[PDB]
Design a protein around this ligand. Structure first.
Ligand SMILES: Cc1cc2nc3c(=O)[nH]c(=O)nc-3n(C[C@H](O)[C@H](O)[C@H](O)COP(=O)(O)OP(=O)(O)OC[C@H]3O[C@@H](n4cnc5c(N)ncnc54)[C@H](O)[C@@H]3O)c2cc1C
Ligand SMILES: Cc1cc2nc3c(=O)[nH]c(=O)nc-3n(C[C@H](O)[C@H](O)[C@H](O)COP(=O)(O)OP(=O)(O)OC[C@H]3O[C@@H](n4cnc5c(N)ncnc54)[C@H](O)[C@@H]3O)c2cc1C
Ligand SMILES: Cc1cc2nc3c(=O)[nH]c(=O)nc-3n(C[C@H](O)[C@H](O)[C@H](O)COP(=O)(O)OP(=O)(O)OC[C@H]3O[C@@H](n4cnc5c(N)ncnc54)[C@H](O)[C@@H]3O)c2cc1C
Ligand SMILES: Cc1cc2nc3c(=O)[nH]c(=O)nc-3n(C[C@H](O)[C@H](O)[C@H](O)COP(=O)(O)OP(=O)(O)OC[C@H]3O[C@@H](n4cnc5c(N)ncnc54)[C@H](O)[C@@H]3O)c2cc1C
Ligand SMILES: CC(C)(COP(=O)(O)OP(=O)(O)OC[C@H]1O[C@@H](n2cnc3c(N)ncnc32)[C@H](O)[C@@H]1OP(=O)(O)O)[C@@H](O)C(=O)NCCC(=O)NCCSS
Ligand SMILES: CC(C)(COP(=O)(O)OP(=O)(O)OC[C@H]1O[C@@H](n2cnc3c(N)ncnc32)[C@H](O)[C@@H]1OP(=O)(O)O)[C@@H](O)C(=O)NCCC(=O)NCCSS
Ligand SMILES: CC(C)(COP(=O)(O)OP(=O)(O)OC[C@H]1O[C@@H](n2cnc3c(N)ncnc32)[C@H](O)[C@@H]1OP(=O)(O)O)[C@@H](O)C(=O)NCCC(=O)NCCSS
Ligand SMILES: CC(C)(COP(=O)(O)OP(=O)(O)OC[C@H]1O[C@@H](n2cnc3c(N)ncnc32)[C@H](O)[C@@H]1OP(=O)(O)O)[C@@H](O)C(=O)NCCC(=O)NCCSS
Lengths: 387, 387, 387, 387
């Protein structure tokens, strides 16, 4: 049960309803297999369905076949997909926000028309690359070179940790066009690379602790020739599209932890009132009643925290410290809650036959992805520093 | 600065502004003295100003001179008074919610007309008595006997821990009218006692750790004769008024922890950017920036949590678990945040010349008053148990 | 390096040394594989090496080829093996403590001579069965029936969650001889079952979150005829051997969390001084220095806690609350430390190529096995209850 | 009763007993008054008694009437006195360690012969001054100027936060002899000032949140003429005596949080088995049993931690990171344990008639005095940075 004390309108309640019911039969039963195999076999198929529901270009203009909604609805879908499968939620998050939302914001009419429609329909998968083997938290120290040869740029180097890497047909890559920029930040440009471009290659998927099924791989660029027309926004003014898209990323991705915390409750609460020890349902012991209370309040507090910040964003009010704040808090709660879920199940929570362990493994990613908890604390503290 | 990302309307923002400005010059300066002396010397005068602002009967019908607003607006005022002074915030809470709100909810036309106007104006001070020396968490085991002698009841016994006790002109007291009730809960009745009634006396103020200035004492009843006309609601159907009031009490009193957390921030943030160690503002060191982030996110999370639950209550959607939830969460956050506030001040946070120590001492109350954290976890756990 | 500020004698420092060097070559390099394949291919061979070193019957009488040492030494070995591989540490614990130690304590001269030698040498593998699908924390509610037919007992029913279950050649099983015992605890007897006894079979190993490699399966008894001579201690007086063995179990198994926290440090410390971000080793940033401090102190405090308690036990002073206290505290520190390890490695900590994720998945078992954190809190609180 | 699982020898157990008994009747009863009045009326007299017991010069050479024992014993004594009174424990700590121990370590035969005997007897009270209004954590930036005029030094400036300040007959002050030293640390000299020296005066005691009764004031030097013969150790080589003293300070002062955590247990345990709610002692409810377990294990862990480190230090093995470690950990545990003590008492824990609130107020000092938790984390992290 999801008490829409969250302050959701009827339409948004309907959105959550539609998603939940759909995912309940199309994604939820596959979740264990996806994680176990580290692969989502129906990925291209699923994306098409997602596009048909209209959730892929949820924040994209109706002009390109988008739904033209806001981040609050985006987090709702994110949260519901993450509830059914953490891996797919992450993949969805890279596609819909990191990629699509970045395109609607900085792409010109041409780029949007050319790319958006297929991204929005699910025919194309999207991804965003900025992280490198030696540039994760310190993203501005990226070394992917982009040499301007006439009306082309020749990219050389590699990207790492890219979600939907080996499946993306369109990708937003950040590269150093001016490696000698006084402030390094003034030497970066964003480019729209496509699957099949000569020189652009991808490595094998990673064997992760969690989010297994969400394909992450290295991107390799060898003399990859990109036409100047594929630059997102403007040359050397890419640190901006990077940074601005990071706030929205943290905002929308906060739905991951929300869906995960929800999922753990979906299992713990019913189990606590079925499993019996010492003559009564384990859920009737104080210690267990306290567990419920804690998991429940953390999920409820984070939900309101994220929902309000998102509503405000849709109103035109977004801030780096507040976007970082919602995910920083949610991420850490998600992990602790998931840790309690396993505890409530006892031995049963410790076996892979139950998804309790999966929620934990998935949850932990969010304290790392979209910026580690440490980098987020810096973002908030610095905000105050500048006041 | 307070970001109304909380989703407050223009009016509500107006309310918070009005309160903040007023409290800043009329209560904030006195706060240290109030705590130190364990006494609010202008209480009566202050109450009439509060009444003039219309915040005493904030949730009371306009008919009796009330504002006719909701719990969200009440939490706002509770928060702002608590920000200025924890002691006075508590006193205000006992008056405006424990007493006044309970009167508007269960009092008949006569009782409301007779008591509400003076309570709303500030001429009268209200209080609510239910706790006893041996009945705090276990409130149902109260043993104040109420003998029915014709058209009167003769109260004999005592009440303990009563806020506004030695100031209340009108008090709502729960007594055991049926000490042999099958389920004890069926033997309790609420009565409206008034200052001056023969038999009814009060003990000396308590010397508490925090909330000094908020008068707490023991109520003594010796053959106090109360007219049957003074029973709140119905005879023996008092456990009910008690329980129902408890939820609204927890919901509205959650503003205390919120105002307290906001108060530590009001001091910590600017201090960290003034005190300098090792050549720079201590607020530039990572450990300090992390502190800010943690205090700030806890405050924001709790703020959205309680505001949204309050909004839902004003829509007619209240629940015991959710009312207990918001305060359980906010209360525990307030204390830790207050602990950090002292930490950030170093030696200075450990001397009484600064209010950092006060914030801690006040904050701790909320983990005990309105039900201990333990009782609140049981409320939530049981809610799930009954599901 | 291990600062033996832990008050270890030269001989004990030597034992640690011997273990560390041996394990570093023989177990550590195969640990990742063991986990990934969920199987220890060299099990039997390894056990014989362990027996050669004399660590299998470490607390067993020299008379049966045991070292004749104490629990402080046993903890050392358990810790070192756990440091190399969590799964094998658990398997070692089951064998050397749960089985062997229980045999040296309650077995008669015959049983000890007939079983101890081969358990001590590594030829045999030992296990202890008490848990059932409906009797984990509530161990007294076990329903494995033991029908006495002449000078034999007919066991019927099953056991669950048995470590070294499919490998044990000798097993200590607790069954209900008197299912109508007034206090149910008066109807339990411990029997030594052997591999190959007709009726007794096992199930397929479990697919667990962590401790993969440590074989856990279900025990099945179908009219398994056990001779009266195989009962450990006395008939119906089994609840006793069970309970007494549980304290020593929790004491010794405390080594697991110790070795796991050490292993985390072994990797995090040097990594923090190799990975560089923003122009410096990440370990030079305050937030990272704080992390080291916390992981370090938690490991150091638990170490002194467990070692001192064990020293006292070897001096004849053991208590249920102190044995439960040692592992309750250590187990919970282990998990959080393990969680910080992943965090310190960033994306690298999140891939199975690194063992950071393994430490987490292994550590969590300790808050479940040997009694959950909840059952341990009860044991301590109850001790004070009786005080 | 403290379980001497702590590995204390017969003689050390006797020291504990002696202290416990003595303090039980001579200090424990006065504790509340001391705190309330922010004054220890019979300080002078008490010191004489402490001296007679031989606990003042506990680690001082028998030659000067000291006991000639080690830090483990000194931690014991510190712990016991803190158990009786936090404020007196601190005062004792400043006298016996900060002052005395430093004198025995860096004072020459003359200085030791002249001051040690009366410091050890109790006839003199000692204090250590290094902190200043703008030099707490950043102690090296102290600005107390010491001009060398022939065979004397003229001190100008002030010290702050000095425990035993108004009572100290002899004080060890650190002052800048070389204000232009390349590394500022090379411009510090420690001096031995006495009460009555022209130019040296003290301000009024501080109104603190806790440790009330332990006199803390500001030192004022105005052309205070100190003979060259009164420098502790060597000119400009004072940062060294300062830094070396800091480790021992942290080690011994860790007894404070230990005594405080024992103190809360001394009250909470029996109270939990006397107060009854819902028909039974509150200590029979799981939530309360859990509380006992938690405060019990934290007290036990920290005890073993600090005891073992102290034993090792007596063996000649001390380290900055380990001395900082024990106090960092103990300090933070004492505060949270004290917080729980208040909780277990309910409303009773919130009044000043009970010491539960005193324990909290006292405890918090240890996360600030002897170096804040932050500076302690830096010390540990840096140690790792160095190797
Ligand atoms: C499954 C997965 C999916 C991802 N998907 C994408 C994607 O789609 N696109 C993309 O571009 N990237 C993606 N990434 C990369 C992700 O953004 C980075 O891994 C993350 O920012 C951490 O970087 P790092 O691994 O380089 O860690 P590092 O930067 O090496 O940091 C390691 C540790 O040092 C700490 N640290 C670093 N700097 C500081 C500091 N200043 N102060 C304190 N502590 C500090 C970090 O917090 C962390 O604790 C993904 C990663 C994973 C694992
Ligand atoms: C400053 C102040 C103001 C107050 N103002 C008012 C007021 O205006 N009106 C009013 O009527 N009352 C008021 N009270 C009383 C307050 O509601 C009670 O003090 C509170 O409910 C705790 O009760 P107690 O002190 O009897 O604690 P107890 O019930 O004795 O509880 C003591 C400890 O045992 C724990 N415990 C109890 N039962 C259980 C259980 N079943 N499971 C687990 N743990 C349990 C408690 O949580 C606590 O930790 C106030 C109290 C204070 C201190
Ligand atoms: C890898 C592994 C290895 C093991 N190895 C062995 C072995 O070698 N031998 C052996 O005999 N057993 C072994 N076990 C079993 C282990 O002892 C049990 O799984 C453990 O005691 C928990 O039991 P359960 O799974 O039945 O949980 P349950 O008893 O169902 O408990 C489930 C949840 O309810 C809580 N709960 C239960 N009772 C209470 C209460 N009174 N108050 C509050 N909360 C309560 C529990 O703490 C937990 O949070 C092992 C288990 C695992 C997973
Ligand atoms: C009751 C009491 C007794 C004392 N007794 C004595 C005594 O006998 N003798 C004596 O000489 N002194 C004594 N002191 C002083 C004590 O040593 C200092 O108060 C303490 O070191 C903190 O210094 P400060 O108040 O100047 O804090 P500041 O140095 O201003 O620090 C304030 C905050 O900034 C943080 N901070 C500072 N530097 C850093 C950094 N590099 N990184 C991260 N965070 C940082 C601090 O941790 C703290 O959180 C006592 C103090 C008290 C309150
Ligand atoms: C560490 C952190 C916070 C700060 O970056 P740092 O290298 O210290 O640089 P900053 O000073 O913050 O900013 C660099 C440039 O971007 C600009 N900028 C920063 N934040 C901005 C924002 N929110 N909007 C617009 N511009 C911004 C800065 O103004 C500066 O440009 P100019 O030099 O032209 O003024 C940043 O690198 C970061 O967010 N890292 C995490 C990366 C991440 O989250 N990756 C996730 C990938 S998907 S898992
Ligand atoms: C512990 C706790 C949660 C539960 O009470 P307990 O003694 O176990 O009894 P319960 O079964 O919850 O309820 C007792 C009676 O009240 C009724 N009741 C409980 N909650 C109710 C609610 N929210 N609305 C109406 N009736 C309610 C029950 O139905 C029962 O009446 P019947 O027997 O007629 O059905 C309760 O005593 C409590 O809230 N204690 C805290 C007190 C407090 O908050 N004091 C603050 C004073 S101001 S500092
Ligand atoms: C829940 C818990 C704490 C309490 O058991 P419960 O069923 O309530 O029974 P208890 O009263 O505690 O004890 C039952 C019997 O054993 C005895 N006993 C209990 N603790 C004892 C101890 N430490 N030493 C000796 N005898 C003990 C009791 O005295 C009673 O015997 P009598 O009836 O003859 O007096 C217990 O079942 C337990 O430890 N469960 C966890 C099981 C476990 O740790 N399994 C791990 C397997 S390996 S992962
Ligand atoms: C912040 C902190 C950790 C570091 O000091 P900082 O100003 O950064 O200086 P550092 O580089 O650490 O050391 C300064 C000098 O002392 C020396 N030193 C540092 N630690 C030392 C140690 N443990 N032993 C010996 N010498 C030491 C340094 O080597 C340097 O001398 P040289 O320049 O001659 O080599 C330090 O000022 C400190 O401990 N502050 C807290 C003060 C305190 O605890 N007061 C308690 C009073 S009672 S409440």
């Amino acid at each position: 049960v999801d008490d829409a004390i969250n302050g959701l309108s009827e339409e948004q309640r309907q959105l959550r309803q539609t998603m939940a019911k759909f995912l309940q039969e199309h994604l939820a039963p596959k979740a264990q297999e996806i994680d176990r195999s580290n692969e989502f076999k129906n990925l291209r198929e699923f994306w098409k369905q997602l596009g048909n529901l209209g959730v892929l270009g949820i924040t994209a203009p109706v002009q390109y076949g988008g739904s033209g909604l806001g981040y609050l609805e985006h987090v709702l879908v994110m949260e519901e997909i993450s509830r059914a499968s953490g891996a797919v939620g992450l993949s969805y998050g890279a596609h819909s926000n990191l990629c699509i939302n970045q395109l609607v914001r900085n792409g010109n009419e041409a780029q949007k028309e050319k790319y958006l429609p297929k991204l929005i329909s699910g025919e194309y998968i999207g991804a965003l690359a900025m992280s490198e083997p030696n540039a994760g938290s310190d993203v501005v120290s990226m070394k992917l070179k982009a040499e301007k040869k006439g009306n082309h740029y020749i990219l050389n180097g590699n990207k790492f940790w890219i979600t939907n890497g080996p499946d993306a047909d369109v990708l937003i890559v950040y590269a150093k066009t001016d490696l000698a920029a006084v402030p390094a930040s003034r030497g970066i440009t964003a480019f729209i690379v496509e699957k099949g471009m000569p020189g652009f290659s991808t490595s094998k998927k990673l064997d992760k602790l969690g989010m297994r099924g969400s394909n992450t791989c290295e991107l390799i660029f060898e003399d990859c020739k990109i036409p100047a027309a594929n630059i997102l926004g403007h040359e050397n003014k890419g640190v901006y599209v990077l940074m601005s898209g990071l706030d929205l990323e943290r905002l929308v991705l906060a739905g991951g932890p929300l869906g995960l915390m929800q999922a753990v409750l979906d299992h713990t609460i019913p189990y606590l009132h079925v499993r019996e020890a010492f003559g009564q349902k384990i859920g009737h012991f104080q210690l267990m009643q306290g567990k419920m209370a804690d998991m429940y309040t953390r999920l409820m507090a984070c939900r309101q925290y994220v929902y309000n910040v998102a509503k405000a964003c849709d109103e035109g009010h977004c801030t780096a410290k507040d976007c970082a704040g919602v995910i920083l808090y949610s991420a850490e709660c998600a992990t602790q809650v998931a840790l309690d879920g396993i505890q409530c199940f006892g031995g049963n929570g410790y076996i892979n036959d139950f998804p309790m362990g999966r929620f934990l493994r998935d949850a932990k990613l969010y304290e790392i992805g979209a910026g580690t908890s440490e980098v987020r604390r810096l973002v908030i503290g610095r905000a105050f520093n500048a006041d």
